[PDB]
Amino acid sequence: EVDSANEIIYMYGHNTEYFIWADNRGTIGFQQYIVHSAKSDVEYSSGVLHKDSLLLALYSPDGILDVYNLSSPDQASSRFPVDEEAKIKEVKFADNGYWMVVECDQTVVCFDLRKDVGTLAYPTYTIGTVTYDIDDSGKNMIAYSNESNSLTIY
Amino acid sequence: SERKAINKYYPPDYNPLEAEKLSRKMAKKLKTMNKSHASIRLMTPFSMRCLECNEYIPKSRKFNGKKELLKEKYLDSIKIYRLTISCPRCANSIAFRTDPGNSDYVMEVGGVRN
Amino acid sequence: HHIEVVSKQMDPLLPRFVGKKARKVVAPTENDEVVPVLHMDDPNEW
Amino acid sequence: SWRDKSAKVQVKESELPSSIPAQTGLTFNIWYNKWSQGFAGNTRFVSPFALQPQLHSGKTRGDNDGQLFFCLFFAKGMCCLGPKCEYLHHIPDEEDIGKLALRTEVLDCFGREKFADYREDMGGIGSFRKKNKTLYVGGIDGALNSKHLKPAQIESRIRFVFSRLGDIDRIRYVESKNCGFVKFKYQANAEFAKEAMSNQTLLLPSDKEWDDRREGTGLLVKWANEDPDPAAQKRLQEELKLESLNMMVHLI
Amino acid sequence: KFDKKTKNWTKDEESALCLADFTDMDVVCGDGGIAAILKTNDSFNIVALTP
Amino acid sequence: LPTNHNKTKLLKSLKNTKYFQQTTIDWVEAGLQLCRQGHNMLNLLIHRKGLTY
Amino acid sequence: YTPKAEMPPEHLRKIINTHSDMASKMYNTDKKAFLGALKYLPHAILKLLENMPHPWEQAKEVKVLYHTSGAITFVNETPRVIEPVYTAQWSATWIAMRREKRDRTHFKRMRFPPFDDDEPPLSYEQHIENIEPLDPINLPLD
Amino acid sequence: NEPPPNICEQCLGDEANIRMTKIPQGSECKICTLPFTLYHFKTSKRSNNIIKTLICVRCATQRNICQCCMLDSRWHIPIQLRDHLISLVVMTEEAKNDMMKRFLSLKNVKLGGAQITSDPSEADNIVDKLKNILLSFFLYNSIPEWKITDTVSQLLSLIVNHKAKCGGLRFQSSELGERFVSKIFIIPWSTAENIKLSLSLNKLIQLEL
Amino acid sequence: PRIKTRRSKPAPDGFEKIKPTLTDFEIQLRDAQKDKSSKLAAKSNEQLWEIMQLHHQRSRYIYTLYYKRKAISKDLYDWLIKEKYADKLLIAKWRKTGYEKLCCLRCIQKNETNNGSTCICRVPRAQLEEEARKKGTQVSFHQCVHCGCRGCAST
Amino acid sequence: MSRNVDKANSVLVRFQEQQAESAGGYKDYSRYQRPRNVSKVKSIKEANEWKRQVSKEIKQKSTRIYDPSLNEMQIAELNDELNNLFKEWKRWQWHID
Ligand SMILES: [Zn+2]
Ligand SMILES: [Zn+2]
Ligand SMILES: [Zn+2]
Ligand SMILES: [Zn+2]
Ligand SMILES: [Zn+2]
Secondary structure: OOOOOOOEEEEEOOOOOOOEEEEOOOOEEEOOEEEEOOOOOOOOOEEEEOOOOOEEEEEOOOOOEEEEEOOOOOOOOEEOOOOOOOOEEEEEEOOOOOEEEEEEOOEEEEEEOOOOOOOEOOOOOEOOOEEEEEOOOOOOEEEEEOOOOEEEEO | OOOOOOOOOOOOOOOHHHHHHHHHHOOOOEOOOOOOOEEEEEEOOOOEEEOOOOOEEOOOOEEEEEEEEOOOOEOOOEOOEEEEEEOOOOOOEEOEEOOOOOOOOEEOOOEEEO | OOOEEEOOOOOOOOOOOOOOOOOOOOOOOOOOOOOOOOOOOOOOOO | OHHHHOOOOOOOOOOOOOOOOOOOOOEEEOOOOEEEOOOOOOOOOOOOOOOOHHHHOEOOHHHHHOOOOEOHHHHHOOOOOHHHOOOEEOOOOHHHHHHOOOHHHOEOOOOOEOEOOOOOOOOOOOEOOOOOOEEEEEOHHHHOOOOOOOHHHHHHHHHHHHHHHOOEEEEEEEOOOOEEEEEEOOHHHHHHHHHHHOOOOOOOOOOOOOOOOOOOOOOEEEEOOOOOOHHHHHHHHHHHHHHHHHHHHHHO | OEOOOOOOEOOOOOOOOOOOOOOEEEEEEEOOEEEEEEEOOOOEEEEEEOO | OOOOOOOOOHHHHHHHOOOEEEEEEEHHHHHHHHHHHHHHHHHHHHHHHOOOO | OOOOOEOOHHHHHHHHHHOOOOOOOOOHHHHHHHHHHHHHHHHHHHHHHHOOOOOOOOOOEEEEEEEOOOOOEEEOOOOOOOHHHHHHHHHHHHHHHHHHHHHOOOOOOOOOOOOOOOOOOOOHHHOOOOOOOOOOOOOOOO | OOOOOOOOHHHHOOOOOOEEEEEEEEEEOOOOOOEEEEEEEOOOOOOOOOEEOOOOHHHHHHHOEOOOOOEEOOOOOEHHHHHHHHHHOOOOOOOOOOOHHHHHHOOOOOOOOHHHHHOHHHHHHHHHHHHHHHOOEOOEOOOOHHHHHHHHHHHOOEOOOOOOOEOOEOOOOHHHHHHHHHHOOEOOEOOHHHHHHHHHHHHHHHHHO | OOOOOOOOOOOOOOHHHHHHHHHHHHHHHHHHOOOOOOOOHHHHHHHHHHHHHHHHHHHHHHHHHHHHOOOOOHHHHHHHHHOOOOOHHHHHHHHOOOOOOOOOHHHOOOOOOOOOOOOHHHOOHHHHHHHHHHHOOOOOOOOOOOOOOOOOOOO | OOOOHHHHOOHHHHHHHHHHHHOOOOOOOOOEOOOOOOOOOOOHHHHHHHHHHHHHHHHHHHHHHOOOOOOOHHHHHHHHHHHHHHHHHHHHOOOOO
16 A cells, blocks of 8 residues: 555556656655655646656646656756647657657657757647557657548658 | 375465465464464373462373473473463463473473472 | 146256255144043052 | 436446455355355445436336336446336335335335344344334444544435435434434335445545545445334334324224 | 326426417427427417427 | 166156256267266355365 | 257357356356256266267267256267167277277377366367367278 | 145235145245245236245234235234234234244244134124224424425425424525415424424534434 | 268258358357356346347248248258258248247247246237237236247237 | 364465465455554555454453452453553554544
8 A cells, every 4th residue: 555645646667676656746656765755736647757767757638747856856856848738648758868759639749858958859840530659769650540540650 | 075185286376385485474474383382282291289279180181281492402402392281270370391301301380299 | 716726847956845944843732621630549668 | 207207227237237256265155155264354345336316217127017126226226237127217106105015014125025033233124023114324434434524414415315215204313323313204215225325335526535435335224223212212102003093994 | 198008198208498478389290290389479489399 | 677667767857847958969068068067066065065175 | 748849059058158157146046956966967977978979980969958057968868779780880990999009109098187187178169160070980991 | 734825815816817836845934934835826917026925824824914915814904003903902922033933833822813803703893992992494393204395395305303303495496485485383594482492492402412 | 050070961052152141140159159247147048048049040041041932952951950050840830830930949838838838929919919908007028038039929 | 283273374274365365355364463563554454454353352351351260360461461452452543544
């Protein structure tokens, strides 16, 4: 029984004596210890962990995207700017180790992690009858259209 | 179902070593097995008097005792045991030890031999 | 009112007499009329 | 108005009506369907379903054919047959009660034999000897997940749940006993209510513990052992007298 | 509907009208479909009852 | 020397009820059924007896 | 009177399959029926055994009675033969066996039991669909 | 040897032919828990649900009741009620015990009252005797809520405590309430003095526990 | 069907045409023959009913092609009968008068039933309905417990 | 493994128990010793079970301590044991939830 009043929103096991879990308030724990405490001013619905296993992105549909460093508890999360009207569907860390790709409803925002927080890898350009997904390289996309019933590769 | 049963049924997945390990893990937690004064049935060789109520429990009288290991062995590698009994009338804990130097027993703050 | 009784053929697997279960039953004697127990008419030896 | 309100019901679909037992014991006994070789577990678990009757209640395959007895499953709130159920799906109205008032001595509104002696726990399907319309409610602490509520609030909640389920005579929450006595007009209605509210949470969606209502233990709804304090007794006596009078009138 | 088993008028369907007090009415129905003529003291409304 | 009286064999009696009905089955299938049914019977009885162990 | 309805085997199969995971208040009575059936299980066994397909037979179809509860299944037919014909058949089989013996360096005798104590005996529905049952014992004729 | 089933006129049905099956030692009687023959009839051929006999004939005889209805053979009243009436002009005590109940069943005394009901003489006399004997808004000022509700309906959630005597009716509509007022036992909105006093007392009582 | 064991010749002439129709049936049967965890008596019964219906249907199809349509050779029909495909007795019953629409044979085993009579399905909807009307109640029965047969009668 | 205890704590039985615990969640809180230091029990159900067990123990203690030979020292000892049990129970009624 995890000791948290807040709903667990992320649970991953291939981090290998411990698993990592995360609260909808940004409590992050290893199961044991707590690397980050609950905030009052956020809600998350999901999370994704970077391949080097130190960066954890927590997020919700409404635009909140906060990246935590699990190596230093004392380090403040980084807030990434996503406009609120663009619904966040998923966040992936690309294989290159430095693209954080944010899959929104109609658009994709790709952040470059080498640079100041908020620096895009490329500008956001939009390309509700179309779902899509990007591979782990962050450079291949398959989009499905419900009008034409067809798959397009970008 | 019958006391001379050759083979007890095992589940289809029963890694015996693994099972043993699991048991061990759940042996420290376990109530019984992780305790002293494990029971035993024994007749009384000493034929002695219960010190509280003077009840003269005679030789060969049967009791459900508690055998416990005394940590301080005799000599080196031959163990000695405390063998608890209750008097029939009053419930005073009589016991005795088995010091094998004399091939006999020793009374242990329970009663007196006569 | 007139009424037709039947006996349905129960399945031959199920217990024939499903009512009975080897119950103990104490019975009252129920002797309302009184039996007349009639009769006629050295203690140290006997 | 259940007839013209709807036809359909389909409370809980036959995909997911219930898992069969809950693991007490080590091994599962095929003949009793109850776990054996051990008994650790308080056992009473909260109903996954419930009777929201205004939504659910409807015409059935039984209604058309002229069924007397109401659907236990419907009451519980899990009648997967729905419109093709042969037992009735509505809160027992007065007319229906009147219709099955001949049989209501021997068996419940569910068409199942009332017993001669009460169960020692007053726990289920009341006796034919003592007619009753009066339900013990209990485990209200457990039914509300140990919530620090006002007794008044609890009482209100009880009323809300039970009024819907049947025509109420009178209700009493008690702080000392930690209970909820309910009395109905008709025994059948009471029975139905009992069936419904067995193992039910008293919580609402607006409460903060809605998502963990399952983890608790439900309402312990049982039959009422008559109240000893004197006014109530007097009232009961009066009622009995009235009934007797009515009977006499009917006779002559 | 007048029910042939139960022998009474039973409530079958209810419809809300989207729009004075109608003090009178007449029902018509043919193969074309059911209409209600709803009357006031000086005006009337013909309303169709469709599937 | 056998029964003068008894015509009524077991199967015939069963047939005379409504609870049995009859099919034509592959013998292996029948055997399998017997094995399963038999197994069930022995488990069921055992469980009734209470001995679930 | 009017004879039994020749039911479909499919129905029987379905019935059988239903009473595998039998643990509801549904079929309370079916369990009772099953229990009762022990009475006739030896009879059933005798029947089935009696109907054993002979080595000149790939697969015997057989008459079957079965309790609609699924509790017991009797092979109903009693296998009668034209005696001399039967004898001839047996002789043929014997001859075939002898030939086989002569042929084979090692004759792969079965292991017993044939299925594992853990493994529950496959339903018949796994191998209805399977290929034509391999050829039975009947000697080369002329 | 077996005695006949005692099924009442209203119990059995309205028709001049009924078919039933007897199941000898079918079930145990509910009173006595002792094997007896179940009769079960369907009333009309097609009318759903059977009517099985729930009690042994002997027990029925003792109580003088329908073997299905569990009501007086004569007057068709619950055993309590029928017995109660007789008492008014002594009642049966069914002994709710595993062993004793069976014994009671086997006794043949006609428990209590049953005799009176059986005989034309006695039942009739009793009846005669009986005849002779016979010949939003809060609400304030005991009676049941199903009556109150009915009254309200006639006038056109309804909470009422009895220890309080304080009935807070909540129609949740300004239309229903304003119709309710015009179309018309103290009834305000959300010997008068005496009433007030009594109410106060009741409130106090409610509030001390 | 039974399993082929070189007993009867593989099939007569026109089997290849009809085979794909009655092989759909096999799939259905297969779907039927398994643990649908019915968790409920009525539901359980329903699967049996379905199975029965399926069985009936194949026979009807066969019967229809051989007697009514008459598009299949006699020999082929005979072969089919010999195999488990068709039901022989059922077919015979159908061929007889007053039994043409016939759910199953065990709906007309008069011995079986508790009341010495046939299944209700055999009553034409007309008569039952009339009775209901006379009484006051609505149409009383839907389908029998042997096989799902809403109005089996020849009408 | 005469006298039943051995049988109970025979490896097979233990294994079975473990399996049960794994799948379905059958524990026997009678069977394991109740932990000394509470707040190493994040689950509520477990805690409740423990509390129940302690209550049972207390009850048992109570039942025996009113026996007729009241002057014997065992009873006196139990009085302290009883107190301890009570304390434990109180502790178990912690205010986390
Ligand atoms: Zn239902
Ligand atoms: Zn009656
Ligand atoms: Zn039919
Ligand atoms: Zn049929
Ligand atoms: Zn039919």
